[PDB]
Design a protein around this motif. Structure first.
Motif, PDB file in Angstrom:
ATOM      1  N   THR A  87       4.348 -10.525  -1.126  1.00 11.63           N
ATOM      2  CA  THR A  87       3.709  -9.993   0.077  1.00 11.63           C
ATOM      3  C   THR A  87       4.510 -10.383   1.312  1.00 11.63           C
ATOM      4  OG1 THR A  87       1.507 -10.139  -0.923  1.00 11.63           O
ATOM      5  CG2 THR A  87       1.616 -10.007   1.491  1.00 11.63           C
ATOM      6  N   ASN A 111       0.807  -1.230   0.000  1.00  8.77           N
ATOM      7  CA  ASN A 111       0.000   0.000   0.000  1.00  8.77           C
ATOM      8  C   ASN A 111       0.836   1.274   0.000  1.00  8.77           C
ATOM      9  OD1 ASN A 111      -1.714  -2.056   2.115  1.00  8.77           O
ATOM     10  ND2 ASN A 111      -2.722  -1.319   0.253  1.00  8.77           N
ATOM     11  N   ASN A 163      -1.501  -7.369  -4.918  1.00  7.01           N
ATOM     12  CA  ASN A 163      -2.155  -7.875  -6.130  1.00  7.01           C
ATOM     13  C   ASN A 163      -1.873  -7.084  -7.410  1.00  7.01           C
ATOM     14  OD1 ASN A 163      -3.815  -5.632  -5.829  1.00  7.01           O
ATOM     15  ND2 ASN A 163      -5.742  -6.789  -6.016  1.00  7.01           N
ATOM     16  N   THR A 223      -2.765  -3.598  -3.032  1.00 11.43           N
ATOM     17  CA  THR A 223      -3.184  -4.847  -2.403  1.00 11.43           C
ATOM     18  C   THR A 223      -4.641  -5.161  -2.698  1.00 11.43           C
ATOM     19  OG1 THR A 223      -3.777  -3.733  -0.314  1.00 11.43           O
ATOM     20  CG2 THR A 223      -1.519  -4.585  -0.515  1.00 11.43           C
ATOM     21  N   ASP A 224      -5.026  -6.402  -2.429  1.00 14.44           N
ATOM     22  CA  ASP A 224      -6.436  -6.784  -2.392  1.00 14.44           C
ATOM     23  C   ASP A 224      -7.029  -6.376  -1.036  1.00 14.44           C
ATOM     24  OD1 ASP A 224      -5.675  -8.747  -0.491  1.00 14.44           O
ATOM     25  OD2 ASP A 224      -5.520 -10.295  -2.013  1.00 14.44           O
ATOM     26  N   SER A 225      -8.284  -6.743  -0.783  1.00 14.67           N
ATOM     27  CA  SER A 225      -8.953  -6.376   0.472  1.00 14.67           C
ATOM     28  C   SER A 225      -8.418  -7.097   1.720  1.00 14.67           C
ATOM     29  CB  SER A 225     -10.466  -6.595   0.356  1.00 14.67           C
ATOM     30  OG  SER A 225     -10.774  -7.946   0.069  1.00 14.67           O
ATOM     31  N   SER A 226      -7.590  -8.125   1.522  1.00 16.96           N
ATOM     32  CA  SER A 226      -6.929  -8.840   2.615  1.00 16.96           C
ATOM     33  C   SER A 226      -5.513  -8.320   2.903  1.00 16.96           C
ATOM     34  CB  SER A 226      -6.861 -10.333   2.290  1.00 16.96           C
ATOM     35  OG  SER A 226      -8.159 -10.864   2.068  1.00 16.96           O
ATOM     36  N   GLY A 227      -5.081  -7.296   2.168  1.00 13.15           N
ATOM     37  CA  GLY A 227      -3.765  -6.694   2.376  1.00 13.15           C
ATOM     38  C   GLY A 227      -2.623  -7.434   1.717  1.00 13.15           C
ATOM     39  N   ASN A 228      -2.947  -8.347   0.808  1.00 17.15           N
ATOM     40  CA  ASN A 228      -1.926  -9.049   0.042  1.00 17.15           C
ATOM     41  C   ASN A 228      -1.699  -8.331  -1.279  1.00 17.15           C
ATOM     42  OD1 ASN A 228      -3.585 -11.940   1.253  1.00 17.15           O
ATOM     43  ND2 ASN A 228      -1.637 -11.162   2.028  1.00 17.15           N
TER      44      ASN A 228
END
Ligand SMILES: *[C@@H]1O[C@H](CO)[C@@H](O[C@@H]2O[C@H](CO)[C@@H](O[C@@H]3O[C@H](CO)[C@@H](O)[C@H](O)[C@@H]3O)[C@H](O)[C@H]2NC(C)=O)[C@H](O)[C@H]1NC(C)=O
Ligand SMILES: OC[C@H]1O[C@@H](S[C@H]2[C@H](O)[C@@H](O)[C@H](S[C@H]3[C@H](O)[C@@H](O)[C@H](O)O[C@@H]3CO)O[C@@H]2CO)[C@H](O)[C@@H](O)[C@@H]1O
Ligand SMILES: OC[C@H]1O[C@@H](S[C@H]2[C@H](O)[C@@H](O)[C@H](S[C@H]3[C@H](O)[C@@H](O)[C@H](O)O[C@@H]3CO)O[C@@H]2CO)[C@H](O)[C@@H](O)[C@@H]1O
Ligand code: NAG
Ligand code: NAG
Ligand code: MG
Length: 434
Positions: free
Chosen positions: A353, A124, A297, A290-295
């Protein structure tokens, strides 16, 4: 490796910035350190060399452990020997330096203090810098990248490693390099075979984020995954990577998921007189979404030159669309180019990640390529014998006979790169323009 005391080690200062979302930035007083492989390595009892040219002293280094006990890395004359100068916000690396002896290239790391590398978790966030590549012809690579080296250079759990980050110890990357003199607190003398380099019995593996590999002709952005993101030690050919007879047999991804604008079909975008005009300085922005899980993407790229914000070029290859690195892009690109997807195999975006969560060290280097003459980066065809009509073969405008080290260390001896104005912060915090 031990701490040599014959020459002071003074790390050149380099300032870099941390920014808020609104573009207000503050300075951090960092330092740069030369990688251990470039240093004088001598006995703890005086000036006798443990390593000279491309061979070891087998009295001082009869095995990996004894060698590490007996041998000390010493201080570096950054400018005079290695052609490394740091001033304010800028780091300049010269390709060839004619000191007491000829030095070719360098690799350096950003430090937070004199015994610790700075680490980064860019999830992020974006990493931004200015670069002058105008002095880099075919066959050269000014690389700015990240690897999850131990912040202390390995000292905490390596009894025979006292030198640590202070002396640029602890390098690993996704090629599992076997030309390192010290790996994981031992020398690499056992199994050493001359090629200033040779290959030892062991390699040093980890994940690798190639933010920037470039010259004036072509540039590539390339994350590389790994089964274990931090340093692991490998055995000879089972290492895989560039120094192995079985490139894909190891635990890292030696190829990565690359975005080179030229390789992706747009030959008008990056280069001399092009949209991103390599005849002048420009800003390189790299964003880690990131995606919504913080990984992780997605990795996006913007350039800024003449105050104009330039989005990354679209891939124009049939079957490979978009202008960023995503799972869809990487899957498509490996399928369409017919390259083995070792990226996905060793964990792809999840691996990267985890590398960020471990903490990345910033590497700034300048090198030529004794394996493939940098043709993978900038050639009209790589492999040289391959058809440029085939997608993925062409990567730049350089001839297939370009970049031979013995040639370019002469003809391009004045080459250099300057990295400057490093900024890190939230998305869109580090740049602006029309
Ligand atoms: C780092 O590199 C060294 C070589 O320089 C690797 O050493 C080699 O390790 C393997 C596995 O332990 C050994 O293979 C075998 O040897 C034993 C007899 O000693 C045999 O019974 C086994 O069946 C097997 O064939 C090999 O001998 C050894 N070679 C040397 C010169 O020490 C080492 O594995 C590497 N380290 C890592 C972490 O990969
Ligand atoms: O001659 C200078 C120095 O060389 C080392 S071995 C060195 C090798 O010569 C060089 O080609 C590579 S370049 C390396 C680059 O730094 C890195 O950013 C990239 O990821 O990978 C590139 C290929 O490995 O680095 C080698 C060391 O890692 C000699 O040991 C030393 O004695 C000599 O002074
Ligand atoms: O990073 C330092 C490392 O660089 C390699 S160059 C290496 C490059 O990192 C990698 O992305 C490409 S993968 C390449 C593949 O080999 C080819 O088959 C395919 O057609 O195209 C792919 C994308 O270019 O391979 C490059 C060659 O190894 C240096 O050689 C190494 O010494 C250095 O340590
Ligand atoms: C190797 O090291 C030994 C022990 O210090 C020394 O006697 C010898 O001269 C060295 N030789 C070389 C070639 O470095
Ligand atoms: C940041 O800027 C880019 C480029 O203009 C824009 O597309 C994007 O939506 C912005 N991102 C955020 C998080 O505001
Ligand atoms: Mg060993």
């Amino acid at each position: 490796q031990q701490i040599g005391t014959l020459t002071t080690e003074t790390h050149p200062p380099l300032t870099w910035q941390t920014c808020t979302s609104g573009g207000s930035c503050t300075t951090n007083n960092g330092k740069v350190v030369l990688d251990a492989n470039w240093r004088w390595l001598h006995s703890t009892s005086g000036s006798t060399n443990c390593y000279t040219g491309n061979t070891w002293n087998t009295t001082l280094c009869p095995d990996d452990t004894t060698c590490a006990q007996n041998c000390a890395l010493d201080g570096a004359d950054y400018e005079g020997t290695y052609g490394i100068t740091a001033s304010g916000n800028s780091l300049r690396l010269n390709f060839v330096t004619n000191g007491s002896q000829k030095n070719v290239g360098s690799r350096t790391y950003l430090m937070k203090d004199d015994t610790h590398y700075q680490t980064f978790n860019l999830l992020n966030q974006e990493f931004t810098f200015d670069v002058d590549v105008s002095g880099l012809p075919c066959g050269l690579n000014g690389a700015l990248y990240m690897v999850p080296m131990a912040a202390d250079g390995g000292v905490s759990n390596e009894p025979n490693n006292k030198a640590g980050a202070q002396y640029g110890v602890g390098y690993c990357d996704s090629q599992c390099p076997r030309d390192l003199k010290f790996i994981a607190g031992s020398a690499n003398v056992q199994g050493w075979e001359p090629a200033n380099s040779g290959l030892g019995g062991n390699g040093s593996c980890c994940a690798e984020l190639d933010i920037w590999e470039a010259n004036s002709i072509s540039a590539a952005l390339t994350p590389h995954s790994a089964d274990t993101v931090t340093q692991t030690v490998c055995n000879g050919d089972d290492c895989g990577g560039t120094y192995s007879n079985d490139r894909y047999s190891g635990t890292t991804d030696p190829d990565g998921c690359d975005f080179n604008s030229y390789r992706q079909g747009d030959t008008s975008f990056y280069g001399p007189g092009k949209t991103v005009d390599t005849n002048s300085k420009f800003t390189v922005v790299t964003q880690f979404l990131t995606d919504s899980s913080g990984n992780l993407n997605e990795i996006k790229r913007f350039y800024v030159q003449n105050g104009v914000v330039i989005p990354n070029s679209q891939s124009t290859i049939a079957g490979i669309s978009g202008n960023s690195i995503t799972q869809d892009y990487c899957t498509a690109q490996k399928q369409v180019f017919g390259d083995t997807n070792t990226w996905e195999d060793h964990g792809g975006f999840q691996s990267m990640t985890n590398a960020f969560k471990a903490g990345m060290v910033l590497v700034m280097s300048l090198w030529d390529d004794y394996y493939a003459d940098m043709l993978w980066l900038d050639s009209v065809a790589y492999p040289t014998d391959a058809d440029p009509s085939t997608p993925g073969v062409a990567r730049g405008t350089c001839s297939t006979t370009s970049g031979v080290p013995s040639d370019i260390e002469s003809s391009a001896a004045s080459a250099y790169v300057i990295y400057s104005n490093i900024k890190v912060g939230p998305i869109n915090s580090t740049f602006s323009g029309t």
